[PDB]
């Protein structure tokens, strides 16, 4: 199928041009479900976090974006309670030129650049705007938790 042919190319690109601070691979023997890891970027409240995600593709990929969820506990204005991510390029701004590598690096960039007008987590959105001191403390807890996560 076209989706499976595309996903083998996504995987090869990750090996040839490895992105810094992120990684992804198929789970077990299923090409349509991937595991992924994103490191919290240095110089941010998320620094040193080792966050685990799952990516689910459909047979309509790359014409349809995959669904991406954090499995690790998260505290971020654009991340829902169930780990789902409000990021424009994973919804209405999706393009077939994006792949696993670019999706992961886009999510990585979102961690230190939250969108205030999309409050998926209303408390994280409020603290980020009002009390940035308390925002970093709440993010610190989930950084620690991401280390003994499996």
């Amino acid at each position: 199928t076209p989706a499976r042919r595309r996903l083998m190319r996504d995987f090869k690109r990750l090996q040839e041009d490895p992105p810094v601070g992120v990684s992804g691979a198929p789970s077990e023997n299923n090409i349509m479900q991937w595991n992924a890891v994103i490191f919290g970027p240095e110089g941010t409240p998320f620094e040193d976090g080792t966050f685990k995600l799952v990516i689910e593709f459909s047979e309509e990929y790359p014409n349809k974006p995959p669904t991406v969820r954090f499995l690790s506990k998260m505290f971020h204005p654009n991340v829902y309670a169930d780990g789902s991510i409000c990021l424009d390029i994973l919804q209405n701004r999706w393009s077939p030129t994006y792949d696993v590598s670019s999706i992961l690096t886009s999510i990585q960039s979102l961690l230190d650049e939250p969108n205030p007008n999309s409050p998926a987590n209303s408390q994280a959105a409020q603290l980020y705007q009002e009390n940035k001191r308390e925002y970093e403390k709440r993010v610190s807890a989930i950084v620690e938790q991401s280390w003994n996560d499996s």
Binding site: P18, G24, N35, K52, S72, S150
Partner: peptide
């Protein structure tokens, strides 16, 4: 549940993501 069952797989991914950090 999921993270625990795929412990080995996630640790390989953590090691790959750590490089150059």
């Amino acid at each position: 549940k999921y993270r625990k069952k795929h412990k080995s797989e996630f640790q390989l991914l953590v090691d790959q993501a750590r490089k150059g950090y």
